[PDB]
Amino acid sequence: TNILAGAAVIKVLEAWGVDHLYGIPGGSINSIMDALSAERDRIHYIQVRHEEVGAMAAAADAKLTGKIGVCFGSAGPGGTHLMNGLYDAREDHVPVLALIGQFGTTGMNMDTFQEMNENPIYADVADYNVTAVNAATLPHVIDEAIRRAYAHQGVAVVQIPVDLPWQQISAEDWYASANNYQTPLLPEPDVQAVTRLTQTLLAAERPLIYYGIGARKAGKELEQLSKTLKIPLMSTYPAKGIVADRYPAYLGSANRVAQKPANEALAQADVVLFVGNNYPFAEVSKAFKNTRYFLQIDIDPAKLGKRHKTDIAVLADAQKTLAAILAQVSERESTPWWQANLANVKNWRAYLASLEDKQEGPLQAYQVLRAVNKIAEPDAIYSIDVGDINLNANRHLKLTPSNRHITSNLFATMGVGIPGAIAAKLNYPERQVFNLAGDGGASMTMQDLVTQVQYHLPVINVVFTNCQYGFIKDEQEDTNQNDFIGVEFNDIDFSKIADGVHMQAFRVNKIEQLPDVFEQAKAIAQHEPVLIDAVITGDRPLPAEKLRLDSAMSSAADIEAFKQRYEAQDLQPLSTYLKQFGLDD
Amino acid sequence: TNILAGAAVIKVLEAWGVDHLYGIPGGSINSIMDALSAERDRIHYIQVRHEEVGAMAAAADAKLTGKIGVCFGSAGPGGTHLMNGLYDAREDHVPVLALIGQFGTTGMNMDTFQEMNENPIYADVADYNVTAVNAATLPHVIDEAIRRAYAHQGVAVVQIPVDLPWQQISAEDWYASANNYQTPLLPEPDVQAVTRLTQTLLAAERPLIYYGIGARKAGKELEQLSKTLKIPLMSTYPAKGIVADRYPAYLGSANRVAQKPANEALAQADVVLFVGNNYPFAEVSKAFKNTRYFLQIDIDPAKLGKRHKTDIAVLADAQKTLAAILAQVSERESTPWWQANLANVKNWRAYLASLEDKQEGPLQAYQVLRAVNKIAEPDAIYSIDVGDINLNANRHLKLTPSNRHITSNLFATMGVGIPGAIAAKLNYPERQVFNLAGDGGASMTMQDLVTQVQYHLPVINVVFTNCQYGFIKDEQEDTNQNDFIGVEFNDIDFSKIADGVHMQAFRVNKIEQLPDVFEQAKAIAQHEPVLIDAVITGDRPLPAEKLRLDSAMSSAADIEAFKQRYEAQDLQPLSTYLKQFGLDD
Amino acid sequence: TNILAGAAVIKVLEAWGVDHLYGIPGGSINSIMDALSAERDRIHYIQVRHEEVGAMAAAADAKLTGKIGVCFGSAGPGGTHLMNGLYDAREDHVPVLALIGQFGTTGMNMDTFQEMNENPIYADVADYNVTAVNAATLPHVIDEAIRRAYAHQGVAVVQIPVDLPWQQISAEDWYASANNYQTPLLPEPDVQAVTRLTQTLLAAERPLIYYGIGARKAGKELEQLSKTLKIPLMSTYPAKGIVADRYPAYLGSANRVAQKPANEALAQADVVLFVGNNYPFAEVSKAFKNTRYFLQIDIDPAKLGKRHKTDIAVLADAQKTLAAILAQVSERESTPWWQANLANVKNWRAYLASLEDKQEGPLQAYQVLRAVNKIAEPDAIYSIDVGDINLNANRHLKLTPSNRHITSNLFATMGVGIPGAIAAKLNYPERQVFNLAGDGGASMTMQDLVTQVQYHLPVINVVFTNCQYGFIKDEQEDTNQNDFIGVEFNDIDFSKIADGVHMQAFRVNKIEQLPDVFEQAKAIAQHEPVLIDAVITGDRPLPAEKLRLDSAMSSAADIEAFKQRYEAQDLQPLSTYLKQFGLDD
Ligand SMILES: Cc1cc2nc3c(=O)[nH]c(=O)nc-3n(C[C@H](O)[C@H](O)[C@H](O)COP(=O)(O)OP(=O)(O)OC[C@H]3O[C@@H](n4cnc5c(N)ncnc54)[C@H](O)[C@@H]3O)c2cc1C
Ligand SMILES: Cc1cc2nc3c(=O)[nH]c(=O)nc-3n(C[C@H](O)[C@H](O)[C@H](O)COP(=O)(O)OP(=O)(O)OC[C@H]3O[C@@H](n4cnc5c(N)ncnc54)[C@H](O)[C@@H]3O)c2cc1C
Ligand SMILES: Cc1cc2nc3c(=O)[nH]c(=O)nc-3n(C[C@H](O)[C@H](O)[C@H](O)COP(=O)(O)OP(=O)(O)OC[C@H]3O[C@@H](n4cnc5c(N)ncnc54)[C@H](O)[C@@H]3O)c2cc1C
Ligand SMILES: Cc1ncc(C[n+]2csc(CCOP(=O)(O)OP(=O)(O)O)c2C)c(N)n1
Ligand SMILES: Cc1ncc(C[n+]2csc(CCOP(=O)(O)OP(=O)(O)O)c2C)c(N)n1
Ligand SMILES: Cc1ncc(C[n+]2csc(CCOP(=O)(O)OP(=O)(O)O)c2C)c(N)n1
Ligand SMILES: [Mg+2]
Ligand SMILES: [Mg+2]
Ligand SMILES: [Mg+2]
Ligand code: NA
């Protein structure tokens, strides 16, 4: 006969399969808390120490599983703390439901304590943004918000006056539509469009296949197409790992969180097949200014012809379309272009291994990442923060289709390393999970290291302490006329921070200390979280976008200073390999 | 002849007298950084570790000095991190200028990296919210934003595309209007309205004068009026300290961050003179349901008759109007009502002293605050966070007109203790500054303990570790039907957190440890920041809004359990004193 | 080599096939007017008399053709006048581009004449809402707006500083992606979900197929499935005409702009197949409270299970799914349910024909729509305003698949009759076009009757003058305790309004004047616009949602009065026909 409205709201979340959700209580959301408390055997509440970590972990849930993440904040400051995690979910287009506390309906608009019109605050980030005003329709409003966040891959926000979840409604006033749920229909490739695209692709002299995370279910077809037709592969940085990094013709990503072979090859390419890719640097970096033909495959009609004048655009699923190209082609023999790029990838990987393999001396970021590779399991998950770690992880981690890695891709909010790792261990308790974060990014969310201890989530946290905002210092070096400001700062000993939250931790500053510390860490993390604070040098990572290696384009003085600064004496420009195989630059 | 637009923007801030500002750099605000770097001898940049601390310190600057606070964030996540500090400035109505980074105008609306339409994000919090599009008008736009934030006591937000501060403009394209600045005109009291108000006030049998921070310049007239006419005084919690807490007829504040005498007297009063007061609990708690006449003094026409049916409302400056009442009255003799309230305040202060004066045993919050009182200088400044510390600081600190204390009053964002103390020490390097914060509030902004070390700001930080969100646990006790959830959590050793940021710290858990630790702390803080982590009991502070003391209204079983739980065996209800002097309840 | 940015913007519109666009000039949009002036041979500019008519005609263009409608307004008041047409496009989910004037970039944020931040004005209505700040990226921002408006079936708004279109840019700063636009090839519906839906529909004893405009391409399959399986059809009001109104088992629409058979049968049905339908009265009128199984076909995942607990929801195209069902069913012999419904429809249409066929007397709305039916061409287009005309046109117009009718379906803004008829005639100069509007609705946009004369658009305008807001008076009769207010008003003689804009017109008030006047109007509209002002009675149309015809549910006194008032003496309740074919109510 009757149920409390708050109890029916928790049953709609259970019907939709939500296992865990994040937040911090307050008087303005204590009736939802009361409903959660009764349901604690069926749905699991994760209490965080700052609400932005709860919204960031909810977005990381949806990034990892495809299932909607759920978080909440109390009225006023609880909900405004959620913003960096909600803009991350909007920009990385993943479904998140956020519930916002509000004063009871009898006190709304009376200007009472911590009571304000909360609806204008969430209007820009959310796909659906409503204040609930009736208890009997509140299960439907929650159901409606989840359906929309899934269908539209964005954020749904509901402000709930605290009195409505304590009202009784009838058990027939409500249902969940979770059993009717379906994912959007995938469009099929037009065969004539595929034939025309294939003919342009085969006629190319210097082809590249450039794919994003829209080609996630097509790693087999990508690799197979590359080796049948002898066409090198390059990706956006989030798409690393779709094709194994060891694959000999994988060039890496372009621009700054980039690898040298991809930047050099893109400038020479005559035809690019751009697949499931919304690379945000296309126009501002003039990435395709020398491309003769640009071919596109994407599921979304708003992306077709968006990033560059597009000669043939196919509106279709990436995997279905690459299976259709592959059904029309045959093995081609090796070309000068194929061989020139293979030799260039070999030269680059030998430069990265030489940085990784130093055995003694002052610790640099390169050897830390080599030690992570040594203890990493084949299906490890990586939550990466924002700064030089995106550049260094992209060059040094060796990923396969069995791994997962997540960061804040487009909004690029620092602080995501710790919440992403909490969400990862909750969803995959049996996989090894790492959190790789710079010292500026780990100190923004450092208080939630205690959430890994409190909920027994064994994460290997690795902090790269350079006592700098290193990614911004290198920008100021490049653009600013006056001296550095706001980029070098005081030390924080993170092994002491970890001790304060009662987590095991180590601090290291020499290359020869790494093997034993990472061995111990790997063993601790079978049961408990652990933190390694690696005190690294201030050395700038080689800028793949400002290469000074080619004598035809840089002075001998610039080239020698570049090689000395980046320990790059053995790198050769792509033009060397192009000339060995008879091609021009 | 020419100046860079970024250099002219920094000269407008210097003309307006800004000494320091807060933020974290990023590529999207590196041209403002470049201008700051050149001006580092004239204006001082405070680099924080999380941008919400920079916006909260900027609001605390304006709360302490009356001068506009200034903060900035880089594009996307830098600026959204500012929100809890910007909503605090809006709700506590203090002037703050926030500068938001944005991608260059050639890349805007291209959907490039970390580039979005940033103007809708700040539309609800700001009084002035504009994206600058021209370099020659940018000094004027900054000048315009400061004039408006001052005149309107709110937030001005300017989004600046990174290319405009690097453009050259002519040194005649700009001026600052800082030398024309004036504060708003104060309206004068109508003499007839003052006479009518005074006659109602003198005819009252049980009068109360109830004032807020709008009566800040009138503490002398408030005390003088109270003792000439024999009328007890009560205030809003922010107004504590306008009249010395030792004054015998100061009753305290009402509702929950309240003192028992003010709650008991307000329920009996027949006439209330409500002066410079916008108490947000008036209507929802039915605070004035028994008041016969309600008299109001305020400078703002939007507040007149707002909180209760008002019999005589005077639109005028609080001090001028109280000086005018005082010029029309003469000494009155003692009354039963005056004496009944004096005896009630005496009984209450003896209960607080008995909690404070325990000499040995398990540490409670009451003795920690007694030890703060013992080392506190007469003009100390207190930055207080949000939770039980507002209730306990309000009852136990003894303030005079020489002290200052700040918290987030109406938005009530946790985490303000640390940024408020940083702003206080920057503005008053010669005054002793304390940061009193609960463990849930101090862990939200704990990373910026390093900002007090880095900029050598000697703050005495006191953390009250109860391993609870104690203020929310007591609410769940009062309203929730099911068991506690999300309010008891794991320990964080804050003396270890402080060691990790290289600050001296102590952890204490017994009453007898306090005198020596606070003595050492007082000595360290002549030169360096120090932190005391006080591990306190989970005891609930006496709820002044749910008193069980009067036998006419509560059962003997409820009264005895109340006295035993709150160690309140010696408190007497106000009805005892009312009956001793011949009045009825 | 160079092109002005405004000339490249008009070339992006031409590339996307925009044939005409609407607006009113002003100083802040005169550089876009300058570029249109040069291209008047390729794109036709329609100067309207009030900018809301421009925005409403642009939404009617997209409703009729599926191509993006385009309108513009000058800064400040020109753009805010667009609002009722932009909300109609958002709510009726059709693509519209709106360009908004803005003061030059050198004067923005200077608080100069008619200059304000215009971006917050359009944030709620628009899917895409940006202020352009650079001339070289302006063609791309217009291309982006058009691609997003089509992909998201909504409104895109761009605010353009007037200086930017007069700046020179290179002929390759731009391209349009119109050539990449295409329709998705959708998968066939899964045969197992189709077979489950077919088996449930065949077992039903009292089935109904209830379709909306999502089944617009399935008129053949709806009609064939209906007569093969003997299942009556009912639709939403906008879906009228998908199956010819003369089809014997078409029941009409439900609720108030409704027909009696549909309302009575919906309350009796056991299984409802809900197809391409988002009927907004479902939950608030408990339309499906007696339904036993509810089956759904929709292409949008956000709609599955939205309107009622749904037993089987198939995500698929309506026409392909109904064709798949039709391919696996065979003839069912006539059932009792089928025959009771056919008898009920016959009785209802005899009632409507008796109102239409009155030959002398005071003119009512019913005989005016019979005269419209007599001169109507089989492919005529009807633009219908909002009010009793939706109810009357839904019952009396006899449409086929060759007709089109449009109104403001969900936002329901009055005044759409004239702009919809202007847009229809611009798109189809060879088709007969009607504007049917009540006197309240026609007077909101009456000034744009001159745009039909100025651009030589031969529309037949029929105004129903009752000197009332008749739709609202009947609501006040049903809900209001006190007397009618604001619903009866002064006469406007629209044949004199038409004469003032130099349009031929007639005013009629007698049933016997109709044949000659409508015969003359049909002939004038071969070359010129014409208006007929029909002065009608204030009789209330029969309320299909408040039927008092069944003795089992209404008293005989109520049934007598209902029959008398609505001239409904020969109408029978559906229960008569149920009992006649052996079914119980
Ligand atoms: C500090 C930092 C720096 C960065 N620097 C760079 C850099 O230098 N270089 C770099 O590469 N990246 C960089 N990134 C990441 C960058 O911001 C973008 O997020 C990324 O380049 C876009 O990747 P994507 O195209 O794979 O993903 P998305 O932007 O998510 O786009 C996915 C695309 O796939 C399409 N799609 C989806 N499903 C399908 C399907 N089934 N079939 C076909 N199409 C489909 C979608 O419609 C969309 O068009 C950086 C990130 C950070 C945090
Ligand atoms: C956790 C927490 C709990 C709280 N609980 C309580 C509680 O239980 N009880 C309580 O009292 N407070 C409480 N507060 C504070 C509360 O939220 C309000 O901020 C406070 O009660 C309002 O104080 P005010 O009226 O002094 O200040 P304001 O709201 O700032 O109002 C000032 C008033 O003075 C007027 N004014 C300004 N200048 C003049 C002048 N020159 N002449 C005359 N009028 C002038 C202004 O127009 C305005 O009307 C709490 C705060 C926190 C953080
Ligand atoms: C004065 C006034 C009163 C009104 N009163 C009534 C009334 O009493 N009764 C009434 O019926 N209406 C009434 N209306 C109209 C009403 O407001 C709604 O607009 C209408 O009922 C909804 O029609 P729809 O479901 O056909 O269209 P829409 O709301 O546009 O929905 C179309 C649906 O079809 C789906 N769809 C689209 N394409 C496909 C495809 N190819 N395959 C499958 N699914 C697809 C869409 O996803 C969507 O769910 C009134 C309007 C006015 C102006
Ligand atoms: C919340 C937030 N503030 C500011 C920025 C701008 N930003 C981008 S990278 C970076 C510095 C990263 O520092 P750190 O984590 O120490 O990494 P490092 O580069 O030193 O490895 C900053 C400040 C941002 N992306 N997010
Ligand atoms: C950012 C934010 N989140 C949530 C709240 C709700 N809230 C108000 S008081 C409180 C708990 C305070 O905890 P703590 O700092 O430990 O103080 P205690 O009461 O234990 O002394 C909370 C969560 C808030 N005001 N601000
Ligand atoms: C712009 C606008 N204002 C108000 C309404 C509310 N409304 C709905 S129907 C109606 C009256 C319709 O009057 P009229 O056009 O004379 O038609 P009638 O019903 O008299 O035939 C009104 C005011 C509306 N939909 N749109
Ligand atoms: Mg760093
Ligand atoms: Mg606490
Ligand atoms: Mg009318
Ligand atoms: Na923090």
For residues C464 and C389, the answer to whether their CB atoms sit within 8 Å is yes
In angstroms, rounded to a whole number, what is the distance separating the alpha carbons of residues B70 and B9? 13
Instruction: Give the closest of A182, A283, A304 to C180, CB-based.
Output: A304
- For helices A5-15 and A30-38, give the axis angle rounded to 10 degrees: 60
DSSP for A502-548, please give it. Answer: T-EEEEE-BGGGHHHHHHHHHHHTTTS-EEEEEE---PPPP-TTS--
For residues C397 and C374, the answer to whether their CB atoms sit within 8 Å is no
For residues B119 and B129, the answer to whether their CB atoms sit within 8 Å is yes
Say yes or no: B30 and B153 in one domain.
yes
CATH assignment at residue B251: 3.40.50.1220
**Helix/strand/coil for C234:** strand
**Helix/strand/coil for A225:** helix
Residues of A in contact with C190 (CB under 8 A): none
CB within 8 Å: B30 and A443: no
For residues B439 and B466, the answer to whether their CB atoms sit within 8 Å is yes
Say yes or no: B80 and B207 in one domain.
no
Longest dimension (CA), chain C: 85
Shortest distance between the Cα of A126 and any Cα of chain C, in A, equals: 11
Q: Is the CB of C92 under 6 A from ligand 6?
A: no
User: In this structure, what token pair is assigned to residue C519?
Assistant: 């015969």
Assigned domain for B223 exists: yes
CB within 8 Å: C175 and A309: yes
The pair phi, psi for residue C556, each rounded to 5°, is -60, -30
CB within 8 Å: B137 and C109: yes
Assigned domain for A20 exists: yes
Instruction: Give the closest of C106, C137, C161 to B109, CB-based.
Output: C137
For residues C47 and C74, the answer to whether their CB atoms sit within 8 Å is no
Shortest distance between the Cα of A120 and any Cα of chain C, in A, equals: 10
Residues of C in contact with A151 (CB under 8 A): 300-302
**Domain-terminating residue out of C351, C367, C383:** C351
Assigned domain for A552 exists: no
In angstroms, rounded to a whole number, what is the distance separating the alpha carbons of residues A576 and A571? 10
Distance C256 CA to ligand 5 centre (A): 52
For residues B387 and B245, the answer to whether their CB atoms sit within 8 Å is no
Residues, CB within 5 angstroms of ligand 9 (ion): C 438-440, 466, 468, 470
**Domain-terminating residue out of A184, A205, A227:** A184
In angstroms, rounded to a whole number, what is the distance separating the alpha carbons of residues B260 and B395? 10
| Cβ neighbours, 10 Å, residue A110 | 16
In angstroms, rounded to a whole number, what is the distance separating the alpha carbons of residues B14 and B43? 7
Say yes or no: A4 and A58 in one domain.
yes
Nearest-5° Cα angle at C325, C321 to C330: 160
CB within 8 Å: A306 and C177: yes
For residues B155 and B146, the answer to whether their CB atoms sit within 8 Å is no
Number of domains within chain A: 3
Q: What's the gap between Cα C38 and its chain centre?
A: 35
Residues, CB within 5 angstroms of ligand 7 (ion): A 438-440, 466, 468, 470
User: In this structure, what token pair is assigned to residue A261?
Assistant: 């072979």
In angstroms, rounded to a whole number, what is the distance separating the alpha carbons of residues B237 and B257? 7
The pair phi, psi for residue B217, each rounded to 5°, is -95, 10
Q: With b meaning 16 or more CB within 10 Å and e meaning fewer, what string describes B561-577?
A: ebbeebbbeebbbbbbb
- The three state secondary structure string of A48-63 is CCCHHHHHHHHHHHHH
**For C397, what's the count of Cα atoms within 13 Å in the CB-facing half-sphere?**
29
- Name the burial class of residue C429, with classes exposed (0-12), middle (13-18) and buried (19+) by CB atoms within 10 angstroms of its CB: exposed
The pair phi, psi for residue A162, each rounded to 5°, is -60, -25
Say yes or no: B248 and B370 in one domain.
no
Assigned domain for B550 exists: no
Residues of C in contact with A306 (CB under 8 A): 144, 147, 177
**Helix/strand/coil for B74:** coil
Say yes or no: B201 and B322 in one domain.
yes
Say yes or no: A356 and A341 in one domain.
no
Report in angstroms the alpha-carbon separations of C406 from A7, B66, C6, C85, C318.
44, 60, 33, 14, 21
**Helix/strand/coil for C382:** strand
Q: Is the CB of B344 under 6 A from ligand 5?
A: no
Mutation target for A interface from B93, B487, B497: give the one with most A CBs within 10 A: B497
Say yes or no: C93 and C223 in one domain.
no
- For helices A336-356 and A388-396, give the axis angle rounded to 10 degrees: 110
Q: Which of B323, B220, B225, B229 is nearest to B314 (CA)?
A: B323
- The three state secondary structure string of A187-218 is CECCHHHHHHHHHHHHHCCCEEEEECHHHCCC
Ligand lying closest to the C-alpha of residue A318: 1
| Cβ neighbours, 10 Å, residue C252 | 24
Assigned domain for C309 exists: yes
Distance A555 CA to ligand 7 centre (A): 32
Say yes or no: A385 and A471 in one domain.
yes
Q: Is C439 annotated as a binding residue?
A: yes
For residues A270 and A204, the answer to whether their CB atoms sit within 8 Å is yes
Say yes or no: A221 and A345 in one domain.
yes
Q: Which of C564, C537, C532, C533 is nearest to C548 (CA)?
A: C564
Residue B234, beta-bridge partner list: B210
In angstroms, rounded to a whole number, what is the distance separating the alpha carbons of residues B194 and B225? 14
Alpha helices, DSSP H only, in B213-364?
219-229, 260-268, 318-328, 336-356
**Domain-terminating residue out of C319, C351, C383:** C351
Dihedral class, residue C128 (left if φ above 0, else alpha if ψ from -120 to 50, else beta): beta
Nearest-5° Cα angle at C139, C136 to C144: 125
Shortest distance between the Cα of B138 and any Cα of chain C, in A, equals: 9
Assigned domain for C137 exists: yes
Report in angstroms the alpha-carbon separations of A565 from A263, A488, A572, B115, C446.
20, 20, 15, 32, 76
DSSP for A384-452, please give it. Answer: E-SSHHHHHHHHH----TT-EEE---SS--TT-HHHHHHHHHHH-TTS-EEEEEEHHHHHHHGGGHHHH
Range of the domain at C147: 1-184
Assigned domain for C570 exists: no
CB within 8 Å: B77 and A40: no
Provide the terminal-to-terminal Cα distance of chain C, rounded to the nearest Å: 79
- Name the burial class of residue A178, with classes exposed (0-12), middle (13-18) and buried (19+) by CB atoms within 10 angstroms of its CB: middle
In angstroms, rounded to a whole number, what is the distance separating the alpha carbons of residues B52 and B85? 6
DSSP one-letter code for C169: E
Q: E-strand spans in C439-571?
A: 460-465, 504-508, 530-535
CB within 8 Å: A182 and C301: yes
Pairing of strands B155-161, B128-131: parallel
CATH assignment at residue C165: 3.40.50.970
Residues of C in contact with B110 (CB under 8 A): 137, 140
Report in angstroms the alpha-carbon separations of B401 from A227, A565, B233, B479, C358.
81, 61, 15, 38, 90
For residues A78 and A101, the answer to whether their CB atoms sit within 8 Å is yes
Assigned domain for B565 exists: no
The pair phi, psi for residue A379, each rounded to 5°, is -115, 25
In angstroms, rounded to a whole number, what is the distance separating the alpha carbons of residues C238 and B268? 66
Say yes or no: C393 and C537 in one domain.
yes
Say yes or no: A370 and A494 in one domain.
yes
**Helix/strand/coil for C312:** strand
For residues A161 and A132, the answer to whether their CB atoms sit within 8 Å is yes
In angstroms, rounded to a whole number, what is the distance separating the alpha carbons of residues C378 and C52? 31
Mutation target for C interface from B129, B134, B142, B146: give the one with most C CBs within 10 A: B134
Say yes or no: B120 and B245 in one domain.
no
- For helices B318-328 and B219-229, give the axis angle rounded to 10 degrees: 30
Residues of A in contact with C299 (CB under 8 A): 185
Pairing of strands C168-170, C2-4: antiparallel
Report in angstroms the alpha-carbon separations of B263 from A112, A578, B399, B582.
18, 86, 21, 21
The pair phi, psi for residue C334, each rounded to 5°, is -45, 130
Ligand lying closest to the C-alpha of residue C257: 3
* Closest atom of ligand 5 to CA, residue A81: 1
Provide the resolution (angstroms): 2.1
Report the chain A residue with the minimal C-alpha distance to residue C149.
A302
**Helix/strand/coil for B461:** strand
Helix (H) or strand (E) holding B384: strand B381-384
